[PDB]
Symmetry: C3
Subunit: 148 residues, 3 copies
């Protein structure tokens, strides 16, 4: 017989939220900001993308994003596709990703039950240009290849 391959692509952006002092109003103290895991998000998007399932939005807060990834792993099995490989590009002026990347790979390879060598995570910069260069936020691109 023959086999089937499918590509997904996720893209996500996270805006940094500056922490600023809590304020009192009408005598009550309100902590504020002025959550989302950008990579796992783009990754879920890529996988549902490859499957013609739309995005994470079609299927669904403060729960560890790892959970969602685990639900996507199940949806993946029900559709009877496997991961061939995953490639990730984190785009950030900062923080510095390099120290944490292998941890990310092990973490996700585990949840997804593939080999570390089947999921690549690299980080680049915009060279201080655009909203990412000004450190207003970060983005990630994910591509996945699925097989049956």
């Amino acid at each position: 017989n023959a086999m089937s391959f499918r590509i997904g692509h996720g893209y996500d952006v996270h805006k940094f939220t500056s922490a600023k002092q809590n304020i009192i109003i009408g005598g009550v103290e309100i902590a504020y900001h002025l959550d989302g895991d950008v990579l796992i998000h783009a990754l879920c998007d890529a996988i549902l993308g490859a499957l013609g399932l739309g995005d994470i939005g079609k299927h669904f807060k403060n729960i560890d994003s790892k959970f969602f990834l685990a639900e996507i792993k199940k949806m993946l099995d029900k559709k009877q596709y496997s991961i061939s490989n995953i490639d990730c590009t984190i785009i950030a002026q900062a923080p510095k990703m390099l120290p944490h990347i292998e941890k990310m790979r092990a973490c996700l390879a585990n949840i997804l039950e593939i080999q570390i060598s089947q999921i690549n995570i690299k980080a680049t910069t915009t060279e201080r240009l655009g909203f990412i260069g000004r450190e207003e936020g970060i983005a990630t691109h994910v591509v996945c290849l699925l097989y049956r």
Copy 2:
């Protein structure tokens, strides 16, 4: 025997054109702006990309973009490749895409003569950052996988 797979990638950007009142000059009324379907454009690019055909520019105005997509469908057949699947990411702060996405999928699946499940369209935002966050325009990323 064996089979062949090929990846394309399109990327397109559309700048919004503000509608502003018509002006008279030298006594003649001139309507102005201060056309392109961004998705079908990136999509054509991805397909010609996968085939080593360059871009839509290598092969060619106000004609419905669906037409071009139909010519790309023919070029695809002459090269004897088929679509495995297509993944699309629309990047926009607005308008709101969600209501129109299924229409897009049906429309394009039809022209391309594949299953709706073979073409995925998702929409994300830049979270109000960069030119897209300021609503100056929109972009789309397309990836396609082709087989023989």
Copy 3:
């Protein structure tokens, strides 16, 4: 038997460096600016990406970028994968790429020892929006598909 496919994705950005007159300080003349091949860079990233090898950074200045591409060609052989095809999107408001693209394709197809038709290079614009629209720099997206 069966075969294996793998996707890579590279993304690179280059900031233009304005040439401005040399300055003298403490009586010594210092030439300054206020190097990297963006495409070959994203391309290497895509290939190492597909292989679960991280990025060019994991494996390594003023040497012709073609060299690095040639080392990536060797790493590719040691892992025993082949290029199915490569798709490149150069994002620039300028300079004008169109005249130089075929040269790029021949150059890289040669080093990589594949057919010109196996590597596609297209160029688009941001329509004068964002850092690329303001001509502050350029980016490239590469996707590659590898087989065994």
